């Protein structure tokens, strides 16, 4: 299989942290002199399946704004997934820590255009991500941003995907249909994308500030939504709101979303 490679090609450099099933390393693909990220699996989990699912999905997608699979080591432990190295780490900490004169209003629009471009691509190929959030996007030089963490991504056969009994999702990014019935779709990615914009507009605040996790769903039912963040352009808030429409099919498509950010990003560039 074309993605498989020899464990011995890679040397570990440093632990990176941030892992779910195992440590995530900064390593070096020696023959190419290339720094890479290496996601490893703790031999002692039965989460082998999910770990391998992430890898399977990354073989099937490719886009400038989706973190890129480089190869795998999966003929025996410890399992490795090898991925392009993004030097600045997660988008959430990147927003909290940045210099806002640099990461300014035009950069915010640039970040959203990047993500929506990726998500438009996924939409087109009938994929869903299911974990879109600042914490799962990755940052490179000059505010390059890529969607990452594809463990939960799926190719749908229809327009809907239903998670299995017992699955739990992060309350404040998850569409109501998904919280209530475990139904996911391109449109539930659109909801999370909306929450992701709010994260960008606030430079990484936690959403629904001070609101008890237990009461968020019920609030959504009664049409409570987050208010416009300070400094957030009116058109951007309209889109955020469109993303949070109760009915999935009232939410804009990512092509429409990308189109609107593309426009706004260009006008701001004069
Ligand atoms: C859990 O999987 C990883 C994953 O797949 N990955 C694939 C992939 N590619 N590049 C990565 N970079 C880092 O992990 C990283 C972390 C901290 C880092 N610094 C810390 C703070 N400083 C400001 C700069 C140096 C610099 C780079 C990752 C993680 C993941 C982690 C976070 C978000 C999305 C995915
Ligand atoms: Mg994650």
């Amino acid at each position: 299989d074309k993605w498989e490679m020899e464990r011995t090609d890679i040397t570990m450099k440093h632990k990176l942290g941030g892992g779910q099933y195992g440590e995530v390393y900064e390593g070096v693909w020696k023959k190419y002199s290339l720094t890479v990220a290496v996601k490893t699996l703790k031999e002692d989990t039965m989460e082998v399946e999910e770990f391998l699912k992430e890898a399977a999905v990354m073989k099937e997608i490719k886009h400038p704004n989706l973190v890129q699979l480089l190869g795998v080591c999966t003929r025996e432990p410890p399992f490795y997934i090898i991925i392009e190295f993004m030097t600045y780490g997660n988008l959430l900490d990147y927003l909290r820590e940045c210099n806002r004169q640099e990461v300014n209003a035009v950069v915010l629009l640039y970040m959203a255009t990047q993500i929506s471009s990726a998500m438009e691509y996924l939409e087109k190929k009938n994929f869903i991500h299911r974990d879109l959030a600042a914490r799962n996007c990755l940052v490179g030089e000059n505010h390059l941003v890529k969607v990452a963490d594809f463990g939960l991504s799926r190719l749908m056969t229809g327009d809907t995907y239903t998670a299995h009994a017992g699955a739990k999702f992060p309350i404040k990014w998850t569409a109501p249909e998904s919280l209530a019935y475990n139904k996911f779709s391109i449109k539930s990615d659109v909801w999370a994308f909306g929450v992701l914009l709010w994260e960008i507009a606030t430079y990484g605040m936690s959403p629904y500030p001070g609101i008890d996790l237990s009461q968020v769903y019920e609030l959504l039912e009664k049409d409570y939504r987050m208010e416009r963040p300070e400094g957030c352009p009116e058109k951007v808030y309209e889109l955020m709101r469109a993303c949070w429409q109760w009915n999935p099919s009232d939410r804009p498509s990512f092509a429409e979303i990308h189109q609107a950010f593309e426009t706004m990003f260009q006008e701001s560039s004069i």
Side-chain angles (χ1 to χ4, degrees):
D1 156 57
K2 76 177 265 171
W3 292 96
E4 272 285 332
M5 45 148 302
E6 207 93 285
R7 186 166 284 84
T8 68
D9 279 21
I10 298 317
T11 322
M12 294 330 176
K13 287 204 57 175
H14 308 299
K15 308 177 193 99
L16 287 168
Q20 199 187 141
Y21 306 119
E23 187 67 82
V24 180
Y25 289 92
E26 188 182 336
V28 172
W29 200 327
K30 299 172 281 177
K31 79 170 279 193
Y32 302 106
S33 253
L34 179 69
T35 302
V36 293
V38 191
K39 301 185 85 176
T40 64
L41 175 65
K42 291 199 309 217
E43 199 209 338
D44 27 292
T45 69
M46 214 73 271
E47 293 152 303
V48 171
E49 303 174 42
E50 307 105 75
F51 194 87
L52 262 31
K53 218 57 75 72
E54 180 174 3
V57 144
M58 294 183 78
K59 290 157 187 179
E60 289 292 90
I61 54 163
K62 174 161 169 165
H63 186 277
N65 300 103
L66 300 171
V67 83
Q68 179 63 48
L69 183 63
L70 295 174
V72 298
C73 301
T74 60
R75 311 285 198 210
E76 81 302 308
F79 286 166
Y80 291 174
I81 296 177
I82 303 111
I83 306 186
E84 64 176 318
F85 185 66
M86 307 293 296
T87 56
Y88 290 91
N90 82 83
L91 181 61
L92 183 66
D93 291 315
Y94 186 80
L95 297 153
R96 303 187 164 173
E97 284 163 356
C98 75
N99 167 346
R100 300 199 188 182
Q101 295 295 310
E102 280 167 1
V103 185
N104 55 22
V106 54
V107 180
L108 302 201
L109 266 22
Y110 179 45
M111 292 179 166
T113 305
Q114 288 182 78
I115 300 154
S116 40
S117 175
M119 290 305 310
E120 182 175 14
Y121 166 88
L122 260 24
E123 176 176 79
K124 205 200 164 188
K125 288 166 58 57
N126 207 52
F127 272 82
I128 51 175
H129 184 280
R130 293 200 290 151
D131 211 0
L132 199 57
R135 64 185 172 275
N136 295 332
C137 294
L138 241 11
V139 181
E141 318 281 341
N142 311 287
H143 326 295
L144 214 205
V145 182
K146 303 196 196 202
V147 179
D149 222 345
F150 296 105
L152 288 176
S153 300
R154 300 286 189 269
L155 171 67
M156 294 187 301
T157 59
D159 55 26
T160 310
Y161 181 100
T162 315
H164 306 306
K168 284 173 183 142
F169 298 86
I171 301 315
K172 297 185 173 190
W173 287 258
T174 295
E177 74 272 8
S178 315
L179 294 175
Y181 312 107
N182 277 325
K183 293 292 158 185
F184 288 84
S185 71
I186 299 156
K187 300 309 188 168
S188 63
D189 277 343
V190 170
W191 182 290
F193 172 87
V195 186
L196 173 57
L197 282 171
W198 183 95
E199 285 187 284
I200 290 162
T202 61
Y203 293 87
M205 277 171 53
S206 290
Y208 309 92
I211 290 155
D212 175 13
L213 292 188
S214 288
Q215 301 189 64
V216 169
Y217 178 78
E218 290 159 294
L219 282 169
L220 295 172
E221 291 191 279
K222 307 191 189 64
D223 205 20
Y224 182 81
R225 304 289 192 272
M226 290 183 284
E227 92 167 313
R228 190 185 148 292
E230 217 178 57
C232 174
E234 214 206 330
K235 258 199 187 73
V236 178
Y237 190 65
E238 290 173 6
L239 279 161
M240 225 176 264
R241 283 312 208 95
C243 291
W244 301 332
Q245 284 290 327
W246 183 265
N247 316 311
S249 76
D250 289 332
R251 294 169 203 157
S253 70
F254 284 118
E256 306 170 312
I257 293 155
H258 174 250
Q259 183 62 268
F261 276 98
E262 193 181 44
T263 300
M264 293 182 278
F265 178 54
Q266 280 162 3
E267 294 173 350
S268 261
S269 287
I270 321 153

